[PDB]
Amino acid sequence: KDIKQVIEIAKKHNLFLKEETIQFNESGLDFQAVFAQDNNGIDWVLRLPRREDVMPRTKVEKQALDLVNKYAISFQAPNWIIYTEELIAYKKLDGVPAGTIDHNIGNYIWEIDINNVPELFHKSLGRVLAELHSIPSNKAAALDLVVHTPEEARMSMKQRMDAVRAKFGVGENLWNRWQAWLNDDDMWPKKTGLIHGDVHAGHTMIDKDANVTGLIDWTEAKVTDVSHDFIFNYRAFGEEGLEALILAYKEIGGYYWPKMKEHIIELNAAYPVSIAEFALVSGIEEYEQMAKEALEV
Numbered sequence: 001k002d003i004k005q006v007i008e009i010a011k012k013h014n015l016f017l018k019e020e021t022i023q024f025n026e027s028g029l030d031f032q033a034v035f036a037q038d039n040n041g042i043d044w045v046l047r048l049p050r051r052e053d054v055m056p057r058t059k060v061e062k063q064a065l066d067l068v069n070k071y072a073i074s075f076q077a078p079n080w081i082i083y084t085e086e087l088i089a090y091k092k093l094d095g096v097p098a099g100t101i102d103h104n105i106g107n108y109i110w111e112i113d114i115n116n117v118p119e120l121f122h123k124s125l126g127r128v129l130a131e132l133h134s135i136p137s138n139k140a141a142a143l144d145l146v147v148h149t150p151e152e153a154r155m156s157m158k159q160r161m162d163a164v165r166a167k168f169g170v171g172e173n174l175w176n177r178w179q180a181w182l183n184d185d186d187m188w189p190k191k192t193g194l195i196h197g198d199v200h201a202g203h204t205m206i207d208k209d210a211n212v213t214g215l216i217d218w219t220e221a222k223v224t225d226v227s228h229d230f231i232f233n234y235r236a237f238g239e240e241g242l243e244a245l246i247l248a249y250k251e252i253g254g255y256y257w258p259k260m261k262e263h264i265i266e267l268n269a270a271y272p273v274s275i276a277e278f279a280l281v282s283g284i285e286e287y288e289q290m291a292k293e294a295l296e297v
């Protein structure tokens with residue numbers, strides 16, 4: 001039934017699949033992901049829409065993907081060869097995700113040892129992020145991404161914090177920590193860049209040597225503080241993993257400043273802002289309680 005639907009929607013877009021290879025991913029509030037080979041044996045990823053207004057809701061994301069596909073050489077991103085209101089499809093990237101969330105345990109199934117991360121993982125991620133963050137988004141004729149100057153990125157965080165406080169409240173010590181960070185001029189970066197915005201193991205494609213070769217799921221891409229793309233490395237691999245990533249990024253020519261590590265640690269402490277915003281917009285009860293606990297109220 002579902003399989004038959006996939007074949008027909010693909011046919012309508014001139015995509016012809018080996019039926020025996022069709023596999024459905026879990027879930028889908030926005031899109032159902034489906035994996036399948038075409039008749040030449042090439043692996044594809046299909047996204048079946050579950051909501052209206054597909055094109056307007058993907059416009060910005062496609063702009064980001066277009067930038068990456070135009071400028072990047074050391075990593076892949078989805079290239080939506082089929083892009084319509086009825087189907088988005090791209091050839092599957094090389095490699096495997098460094099970890100994939102399994103919801104029946106509430107954590108990743110990892111492809112690397114988090115207690116002994118290969119050095120090449122941090123080195124290659126630093127290369128990839130440095131390349132990404134230096135893409136010249138200004139050379140596009142139209143850009144509807146959110147774009148922040150360094151000053152605007154700081155003001156954005158300040159305003160987002162106030163809005164969360166107004167809605168949920170924030171614990172007193174946590175709020176004071178946030179304000180001390182906002183107020184420390186020396187902490188803040190003097191350059192912004194095109195970011196992925198949701199870098200974590202499930203979106204990070206690696207080869208057999210744990211060299212990063214691609215990134216998927218670009219819905220959170222924008223031009224802002226680059227520091228967001230370092231957060232997961234810290235959260236998963238601790239200060240050592242954060243330092244290793246910063247070192248690689250610096251040494252290949254990424255923008256570095258003396259308080260970069262400290263700033264990223266403070267941004268991590270501001271993660272409750274993000275979970276609170278997601279709880280609000282999504283309406284999902286589980287994230288509402290997670291938000292309240294994270295905000296220390």
Ligand SMILES: CO[C@@H]1[C@@H](O[C@@H]2O[C@H](C)[C@@H](O[C@H]3C[C@@](C)(O)[C@@H](OC(=O)CC(C)C)[C@H](C)O3)[C@H](N(C)C)[C@H]2OP(=O)(O)O)[C@@H](CCO)C[C@@H](C)[C@@H](O)C/C=C/CC[C@@H](C)OC(=O)C[C@H]1OC(C)=O
Pocket residue numbers: 101102103105106107108198200202220232235236274275277278281287
């Ligand atoms: C992929 O991240 C997951 C989480 O899963 C994500 O929980 C987010 C809150 C969702 O959302 C994301 C993106 C975002 C854009 O929605 C963002 O929202 C915003 O910034 C604001 C918005 C208005 C633009 C929000 C804060 O985080 C993601 N889903 C629903 C999209 C969802 O991944 P999943 O689907 O793959 O499961 C987590 C639940 C919620 O924390 C999975 C769960 C099984 C949990 O038991 C497992 C926890 C593992 C801990 C170890 C650590 C190294 O691992 C991570 O650090 C990854 C982890 O993150 C966190 C902070 O622990």
Ligand SMILES: Nc1nc2c(ncn2[C@@H]2O[C@H](COP(=O)(O)OP(=O)(O)O)[C@@H](O)[C@H]2O)c(=O)[nH]1
Pocket residue numbers: 025030031033045091092093094095096097100202203216217
């Ligand atoms: N190996 C691999 N997995 C992919 C690829 N594209 C999507 N996936 C898998 O499909 C899942 C969902 O795709 P994603 O673009 O993140 O969509 P989401 O469900 O909206 O978050 C990912 O978490 C990956 O496990 C790809 O190119 N390669």
Ligand SMILES: [Ca+2]
Pocket residue numbers: 198217218219220
């Ligand atoms: Ca997404």
Ligand SMILES: [Mg+2]
Pocket residue numbers: 203217
């Ligand atoms: Mg995803």
